[model samples]
Target: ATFLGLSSKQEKALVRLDKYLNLGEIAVSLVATSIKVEGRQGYYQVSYKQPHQLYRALALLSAALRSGQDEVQIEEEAAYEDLAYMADCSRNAVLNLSSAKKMIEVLALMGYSTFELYMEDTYEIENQPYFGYFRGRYTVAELQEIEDYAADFDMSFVPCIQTLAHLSAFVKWGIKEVQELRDVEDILLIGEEKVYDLIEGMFQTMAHLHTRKINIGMDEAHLVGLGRYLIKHGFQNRSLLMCQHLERVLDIADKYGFNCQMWSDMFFKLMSADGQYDRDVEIPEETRVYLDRLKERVTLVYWDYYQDSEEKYNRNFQNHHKISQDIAFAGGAWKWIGFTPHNHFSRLVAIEANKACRKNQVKEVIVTGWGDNGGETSQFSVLPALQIWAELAYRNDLKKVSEHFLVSTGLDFDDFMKIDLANLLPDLPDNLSGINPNRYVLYQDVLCPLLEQHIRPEKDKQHFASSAQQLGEISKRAGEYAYIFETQAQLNALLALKISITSGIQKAYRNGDKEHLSALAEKDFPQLYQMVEDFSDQFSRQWQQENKIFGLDTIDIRFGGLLKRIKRAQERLEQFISGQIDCVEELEQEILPFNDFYKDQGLTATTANQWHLIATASTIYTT
Candidate 1:
């Protein structure tokens, strides 16, 4: 690959690439050319519309060099004109400015045309001090810094912000000014003048970036006219009310010369019998007409992160095309489920979604990395998922994509796959799905053991132990990404110690074996507590490396509580075995099978992702 010679009018981007690729004086010239070089034997003319494409050509050059072929010749074009990557900076995991820049570089090199940071209330708005207050909202300058950095790679840094809904973060503050804007749980009051006033501030904030593209998030405002809006104005057609809200929001977008994109779920919800989107749901003609007019002003984004088949995506695509010609498909990288990412599952779904998008001639493709449920999973953990989307966007050959992944990233594809071991359990159907036991199992209370039935004590321990060992080995070869693997390995190691300890406690107490209980309390309990402490420290290091300090408090408080709980469990066990207490009150009750209630409901086993649910069966708080 050293035979590769790079050239571009994007001198700064070229210089950055130069530091990484390390082109040497080789006899052959896999010479680079751009839409922005050579007449020799190895001369290759690569034509591209963006700098990312040239980088793709360079990857082909590297792969060609490894093949031991005489000459390299191939014609490739991306299936989607706009291949974009979005990172959710909301959900308490705002990416640090420096780390955000690094992610953009990685995405740009992988040939993504655009980068979007999904900010629900994580970006600052003018004059509204309570807006994103204490939630690590980015300053206007920070947004511009990201925008300018993306431009260096010829990639668009699109601002994605909520204009109508998903403003629960802002509403939670209960500040008088923000309270007036809220209608329902997360939806904004449509008729309120202050609502549009706040919306304009959001648009004006991004308008300063001078980027033409914007994503005004108006998805899932299910209670559009049903909340405070309904009390003020009598019951109205929810779809029409939402349409009226969109027009008012779009008016502000139009004032700034912005092209907009938004989630397509609400429109589907408007047509469905229930307020949920379905692939086969019929769209009312009047409802279709209402959304069809949005084509010139906005592109409807059909986002499906879980549907596993091409037919499902195609059917949705067919329905979307019925509504508007201009549409984009948003697939997930699956980082939001818990503290672990489902990269393999993301690829599994993206494989089918990509095929559907290509078959339907979809013009734009977006891969989303959401930080749902406190954003416990590191955004960087979705690196493998991002690479998967990039590969699928440009090519279909699995082997070729593997080769390109290795050449371009200088990291083993298999090594990165080990990160999935944090969530991957042995012989479970939902293991391949998005259900994350890695989190629930770790956080599950020792006395309660909410997910106890899901634990295959011996086998699960071995799975996590093996995962820890494999990830430990991979950490050595992961280079700069070693911290990621190290964090996962530590988590797996902690889980190995944690997975079955609750069961052990229960059995010892049930059998009336004080000796066993004493051993557990004295020996095993300390080891587990120390391991949790170690993992917390290591995780803190990892978090600081990738994210802003503001969100770290959430994890810190959770860990502090966990450690206190562990210590309390230790004291209780020691006290019980010593006969200080007549019996262990918590353990005397029957251990009902965890998640058994969801069986008849057809939900995946061990579906608990939220920490509150996993931590204890008892209520954490009451409103």
Candidate 2:
């Protein structure tokens, strides 16, 4: 029955009116008819008709209430505040409980009422023993505290756990139960009791703690061991195996009373005619039918991390639209953002995605920030991007949003545009000459070939292997460059700090302990913190100056190349110091080692042999 209190005759008349005029005029007539009702009961009676009619009347009543007049007024419906933000806690850049709390507050301010904590290996129950000293794992109490705090702000906290794949951390924990049931080399062994036990345990633990939703990450399951499993079980097809494993995961999720969400690619594959399993390929029709049956029970997390161009964005949006329409279930589109200590291009991309999702009628948009391969840095780099996403998700005005983000993050647009923290160094002119070499190459060259090679082996195996090796070499070089860059930057800052400290001493010598002062002057280690800060400031100033002279593009290219050089230098420096340190433990025994002390002073020793290695590596490989 309709909620609006229209009599049967009146409702029939309204339908006829709707058929005669457009929907807009019929809605106006209904509202105009509802105003004749007198008291509270009369309004209640009017709301007893159709749900849609009731909603229309309520909308008009709200407008009338706002105008402070007896006449009914109708205004536009309120947009859903379904803003979602994803934080990748997998990177070495850890966010403690306090930091997570702050993030919740920040997201709330930006109009995001939902936060997805992407916990990969770090959230494992077994790893707690090993991670205590590192402050890595989030304790139950801590997660609970954050949940309680978020509730206070009327926000929902969704726990994102990798159920099927991305279990590297769990594997690393070396749980005997899992190891015995499934081969470590082969990951897809359906009906493995141990595997099920582990996953079930994870769900039970996390589900109890989670208040709203749970995201079961099943993306990038390249090593599903379908062939091996089929051979072992004497199965005819791989599709059966896929269905079996998914059913198991789905069953577990159902048992736990949690709504399941997974990456859409696998389901898309099941729907496809060829059932292609490549990462870059789209979902086929066959897979869509399989997913259709489960639509009532599941939600698809549509993740498009590498959409830079408008065409790609539009394509992804269309794909999401089709999936949503086919399954008749909620679909959440995911867009990845930049990592910390890097450029903010990802933020702009996120803004574009948000606009695209809205245009395509997608209800939810999730902004994801991934910390490359290792968990090394904090989530600071992605903050600016997150701010932009927050603005876009809330439908805030762009000019005001830009101003707010700049003020909030203490960053200018140039700062966001200039940095490259993802280690995706722009390629040389030669590399860009190729015909659409992967998205990674177009944006950041170092990662392009590696990702393309890894994702598509049939098309480019030899090139992929070669690029893989090249990627490793480049990464090593990049690491060396980072060391050198950090070292040199630190050294310059140290020099300034030493000068300042020395001047301070010479002027007064306030806390005069001649021995202490002498030791500090000789070691120059006590001033490291001050020097680091000073160096950062100096580097920013120099970067700005260089940026002005060379433009951001040239500066990015030059600095990116310099970072490679620094990586090589650091490798040489490490090799030279390794034998002298005796053991890895001894390397960290003291704050500033005696050998490094000499190196910092520019003194030569047997350890200096690696210097030649650096010169040769740089001279030969670079340029």
Candidate 3:
């Protein structure tokens, strides 16, 4: 029943795979070969050069058996040499160790070669106790453990950390250790000794990770040299400052024997007219010469998550090649859009991105799962997109993707696609866009609905109601992942009632109908409040299962605030009906269109993902 003969790495990979697949009745063995090789379901023997190749070999064999095939010869080679995944652990949801390991296991089956957790301040440093303080930072033992676990699957576990910018969590503490290091918001002081000290500490913390490849995040340092650096040095060129900072970081990486890769946007921003990476923009000859030299030492990762066109990606690739031969592409699996997943949009764009990579002969590709706003979306929601990346990499046949995904993941691809339905607005065209109504509508206040104009009361009510029913049905077949769908199902059910309640109350108030107002306060208000409470419980359970306990406070605050607002509205209505007040001034105010352009065009402002903006019209905080 066990594998007859395998190298230690192959045995470890298959052993973990067996835990997921329960292949106790099947015997398997891998044959290492320089040439291509393939075999069948019953006589399972796979040929592979590298240990990681055994992962896909076992996966293909499993898929064949799952598809009821008696004999199958499967040969696969990924277009890219290093296909990787980077989860946004820096955001609110730092994935629990079990969740991270689960991702590594599943991605291995999908033929992923490398794994990274994007930690801006979510990993421990030896000397700097406050580096990731209170941010659910991973201990050194935890990192080494996951690194070793990934090795069992023959996957490279790389350290991805911010060296220059995107350290808001790290810098927000304003401690004396980091105070002198702060140049501007999130960007560190470039020429300071303390900055290099922090950088070395970051590298030292990750020394236990077997990988020499490190992703030293230097992306989006928009105000790199314009703050305290400018105060001391007097207006140095931003791009030049980036070059200097990179040189210093590389020196530290060299000390630890790390091969660093950085995001390429800043380089393009320097040459572009609007300070952004443009496909058509040309790099200066002198600037090209400057970057050409650095290309030998570090790789520039060209990351694009928005564009959906193949030609657009090709153009971006063309421009990147001009900068340096050492280049990689970082496409996105859109978990950052909101609390809901954009697997649909992510797949649509990533397919073209992969095509561009293949066409351009770009050998490295990493799919990023970013948790932009509070990391509310579950990382597992990106499973469909991850499968898409693997399908494109190994088999390019778009039609067979679903079959392979269902077999390998043990979850239906169709059911996973249904999660995206939470974001699909009723009247909107299925044209792939980042508009997420699921998030904006959920946070939209009851008393003063920010998106009242965008609210399609009858249609949205029907949409969520039907979505809830469909998800509830799909949950029966979802197995272990049924809780994911069930959480969204409860949310949809809550939205069905919450979406139109504000309009109904406004209409009743305008008509001077005391009876309707009293019914709304006593009946509808209590019912919706209970729904919100129940949905919060379900969502929290989902979060706790996949993520650490640190970030749940953010969800609690948002939901707790929503409940308080609803209860307060109920009390005000009750008091007014009981002759406790003369009039409700807040309700008397006239409602205007939230956005005239969107209203005139019959478009829902579905991209409003910011909770603070939707929860109230007032400013969330004051300095």
Candidate 4:
């Protein structure tokens, strides 16, 4: 391999690569190619067609450089430092451009060479005048600045603009103008011809601003503008309307000279009636034909974030690969992990997928960071995870990556509580184990009972008020647990927040104090919110630190489900705080109707109607 320039770090990577690869079965080949050195302007001539193969070859060479060898075959092409980091910037939680740039810098350090800004409407230039309250919108100049900065680090910045669904940001802005043509969820309604004018305007502006590929996001089209348009045109086949809508969007991309990419979920139904994929189910013949037709015009980005489990992961990976291969088009795998300091799970999954793809000779792996359902909140917490991803994707050794992670993230190995998380085996432990257990036990056992006692109606108002004053003490205890670097303590702090909020609600209800209830409904609930926010922040930070420390993203990948549970808990708490229901009985009534949502499913008590759990728990507080 001509590109066999060895650094100490590169030498370490070879050791790990040798252990993982079967040298006997694999044959190595090297081809000549252009290589750009950082300081020098012109391309340095190199002997390699694939960068990843060159990376592997270099690793092999690094080993040889230390031990001495005359020749070695390259199994894989040298992997490029060209890493792509994507973040959904349009959701409820918006990322400032500075923070986004900061993220790019972090990725650069980890050997990433590309950053994809997934802008949904949060950074719209035309609509900024309308929705400026959300966050800072990226102007054409600001975007150019970002691109310029990225160029300084030899990283490409790509614009990810949604063309079809997930265009709520645009819909929210243009709905009134094109209300008549809108669909069930306002997902389509690209306002007849008028909406296209606005879209063209956006495309023109973005085209001038973005130099690389313009990602036309065409993901979830569940609510295509069929129903509304059907009513207008005297009822037509909805699916046909969807196809036409996509075609129109594709036409726009073609005209603008932009490379098109879209999520491939809506084209076929993967899930059966029971919400599980039928083993016999294959991509519909019609969909495959349609994709074949569009293969020339668009890239199908297959996103299967839920496939972290080994079974699902393998199934989805093969399914996606077959479809992409059959179509003979470029495939971009969308990989996501929790955005937290401690979660290495996503990084692990992406690395594994990257390895699989490289081994299979699949090019173009795009690792995505999503704040899909609830909008962005703490997804930014996964920066450290992305770092690990950058290294693994670039074929850097895990040990070297871990040492770098510890220094960059400011976390010690003990603070991560990785052992407990690993101990959970198949189940992902919520990073709450790092907090103190005694504090959790104290809040759940002692403070909760005391608070419950104060909320009883038989207690004197004055006495109860005085007792309620003891909440300060409880808060202090909870904070102590929260600050402790143990999962149990963190869990206890979370419980304490729940108890405090519930107790307040109970006291307000018992005293018939409408002011107290309203205040509790509004301001007091933030205590719980703060705890959740803090937990998410701390766990993510720690996860990143530990992942880097161990150079293993796979640990968190196996346990990634725990992050989902924590998210569910946060959503439940939000419902509780938002006055979604007035009282426990009202909540119970609201939830009882959803019991049928889980009827035939053999769900255990713990996994029963999530709504019911929240409602019932509230009832415990009220009664």
Best by lDDT: 3
For model 2, residues 10-46, the per-residue Cα lDDT tens digits are 4643443332122231123233231222223123223
Candidate 2 structure, TM-score to reference:
0.54
RMSD of each: 2.8, 17.8, 2.2, 13.0
Best by TM-score: 3
State the TM-score for model 4.
Answer: 0.58
Please, what are the lDDT tens digits per residue for candidate 1 over residues 329-355?
998988887777888888789889889
**Which tens-of-lDDT digit does each residue in 1-623 have in candidate 3?**
56766877676666667755544466676552321334454566667765676777676666667677767677766688889999988888999889888899888878789999999999988878778888899998999888888888888998789999999888888578878889999999999999999999998988877889999999988888888999999987666677778889998999999999999888888767888886456666655666667788999999998776888888888888776788899988988877789888888888888888888899899999999879888879889999899888887756767776775668779888898777876667544466777888888777777777777888888999999999999988898888889988988888888876787877877787879889999899999999999988898889989988887888899999999999988888788888899777767877665554444455765467678877898878645
Segments in model 4 whose C-alpha atoms lie over 4 Å from true places: 1-82, 125-135, 173-175, 178-181, 234-240, 270-289, 308-311, 321-323, 326-344, 373-376, 396-400, 404-623
Model 3 residue 130 distance off true place after TM-score fit, in angstroms: 2.2
**C-alpha lDDT of residue 202 in model 3:** 90
Q: List pairs with backbone clashes in candidate 1.
A: none
- What's the lDDT for residue 110 in model 1? 74
TM-score of 1: 0.94
* Arranged by lDDT, best first: 3, 1, 4, 2
Worst 10 residues of 3 by lDDT: 32-41
State the C-alpha lDDT per candidate: 0.79, 0.44, 0.82, 0.45
lDDT per residue as tens, model 4, 57-126: 3333333333333343323223542457776655434455555555554554444556777776645546
Per-candidate clash tally: 0, 31, 0, 43
Q: Name model 1 segments beyond 4 Å from true.
A: 1-9, 26-42, 66-70, 279-288, 430-432, 596-605
